[PDB]
Amino acid sequence: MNTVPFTSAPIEVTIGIDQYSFNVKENQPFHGIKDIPIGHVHVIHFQHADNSSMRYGYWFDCRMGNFYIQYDPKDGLYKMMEERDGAKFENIVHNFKERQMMVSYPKIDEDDTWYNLTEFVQMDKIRKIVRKDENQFSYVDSSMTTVQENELSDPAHSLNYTVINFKSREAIRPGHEMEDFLDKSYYLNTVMLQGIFKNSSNYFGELQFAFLNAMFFGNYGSSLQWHAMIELICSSATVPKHMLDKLDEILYYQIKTLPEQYSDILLNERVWNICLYSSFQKNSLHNTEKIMENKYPELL
Amino acid sequence: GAMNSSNYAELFNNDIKLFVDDTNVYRVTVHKTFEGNVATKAINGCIFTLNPKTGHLFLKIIHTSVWAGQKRLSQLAKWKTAEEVSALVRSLPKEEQPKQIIVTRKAMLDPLEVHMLDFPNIAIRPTELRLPFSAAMSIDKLSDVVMKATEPQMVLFNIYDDWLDRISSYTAFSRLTLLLRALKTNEESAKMILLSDPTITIKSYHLWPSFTDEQWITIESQMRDLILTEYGRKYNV
Ligand SMILES: COc1cccc(CNC2CCCC2)c1O
């Protein structure tokens, strides 16, 4: 179990730790979050009580260093930082725990939700999508645009998701135009899995990371990426059977975690209806289709 | 974006463009089988690719052999159209290639776009105009070369004959669409109008009769009558 201490909480903010959230009042004696499960990436995220504009946060893995949060009154936000002095850190954390100034990561024993949402997400891949090499953790916010969005403007602050474009020379083999557009297996299996991602685990990891940025930060380009990666699989006639089974599990937990009030903006009607009811894989996503039909029958 | 009444004179500017109509590519007769089921039999078709400024028509004849052994022919027809238009463009010298292609049916947009990915600077556009190019097969000489073809073939026509010597391309296109709209609404009466007078002939190298300027005004008036009529006969007005 690891800890992310806070120097202080000078501004009233709503703090999220993965799917959990709690409110901290202005100058409330809050010094961080303890009992964070080891073995998973995590995301700490914030919304100022004053300006709900700009939900922002940090992806991290406690195995990679000792991290803390400190408010910067100049830049006006809670910043993640690494403490290199491990004895200063343990000493800091021990004092805050002794004074019980920390919230406990509130995981139910039965509950595999976070594992299931982050199964294939790796910090090393997050850091290649979010490029800030000097830090071990990655900042994301609501407003950050993707490389592909930038092609249709500060490159330093972009989400470098893998570009997917169904009407592109990468996607369409000369002389296989109709074949490759109507059945995207070539593009999925050769171009993307074999060529770019190397394996389906890396593909699923980017798909899961995109959903989580889309859900927690309302990041529109992330939602576009998540739906494109779903649609590329569903529009492929030839997909390894283990991939379809895993995709069904992935999407199931995403839809179940998806709060109902954010569904209208986070779910693309066309992709989902095509995927569940028209695509090659219309009969391959039993768990996802069941939860979609019982939780969001209006979208369909 | 979409071509409509608002941007209609764009058709006659000096940016090369082509209309593509696919409505006669896949043509069938439906008939009963000996067992009393229904079956289709394909007949020859054609892609109607037209430069509205110059009148140049690239008639790509679609022979029935192209459908042998194929499934989902209506879908294939759009992709075959797009394959043939892309081949046409690649065959033209760079300075003759179009700067836009306007498809008369929106279902041709994605097939054409995918086949033209090599030409990112050629704009593929739909239109809101209800153009009557389906009636091209009511032009006897075009119908004749399509039905006689024994293999795939491209035939080049000027659908305006020599009209551009005397009228603008705006006026010529307006005459063409009036003639074709008439042939589409009532083919027999339209053809009677055009041929009734034995003394007006069709030159060997032309598609329509050699009307004087005055006779075209009479003809054009008779076609409007026809269309407005049938529009009553149809809706009872
Ligand atoms: C239940 O999972 C969620 C999905 C979207 C948004 C939130 C809450 N975001 C908080 C964290 C920072 C202040 C607002 C969730 O908890």
How would you characterize the overall build of this protein?
The complex is a heterodimer of chains A (300) and B (237). Chain A is of the alpha+beta class and 300 residues long. Chain A contains twelve helices and ten strands. Chain A has helices at 86-98, 113-118, 123-129, 147-150, 177-182, 185-197, 200-217, 220-234, 241-257, 263-266, 269-278, 286-295, and strands at residues 2-5, 13-17, 20-24, 32-36, 42-48, 56-60, 67-72, 77-82, 103-104, 138-141. In chain A, helix 7 (200-217) runs antiparallel to helix 8 (220-234), helix 8 (220-234) packs parallel to helix 11 and helix 9 (241-257) runs parallel beside helix 12 (286-295). The longest helix of chain A is centred in the C-terminal third of the chain and has 18 residues, at 200-217. The radius of gyration of chain A is 21 Å and the shape is elongated. In chain A, 34% of the residues are buried. Chain B has 237 residues and is α/β, with parallel strands linked by helices. The longest helix of chain B has 23 residues, at 213-235. Chain B is globular. Chain A binds chain B through residues 167-169, 172, 177-178, 181, and chain B through 76, 79, 82-83, 110-111, 113-115, 117-118. Bound molecules: 2-[(cyclopentylamino)methyl]-6-methoxyphenol. Residues 14-16, 19, 21, 45-47, 55, 215-216, 259 of chain A line the site of 2-[(cyclopentylamino)methyl]-6-methoxyphenol. The site of 2-[(cyclopentylamino)methyl]-6-methoxyphenol has 12 residues of chain A, from strand 2, strand 5 and helix 7. Chain A: The modification Phosphothreonine is found at residue 257. Chain A: Component of the U5 snRNP complex that is required for spliceosome assembly and for pre-mRNA splicing. Involved in splicing pre-mRNA of the A1 cistron and other genes that are important for cell growth.
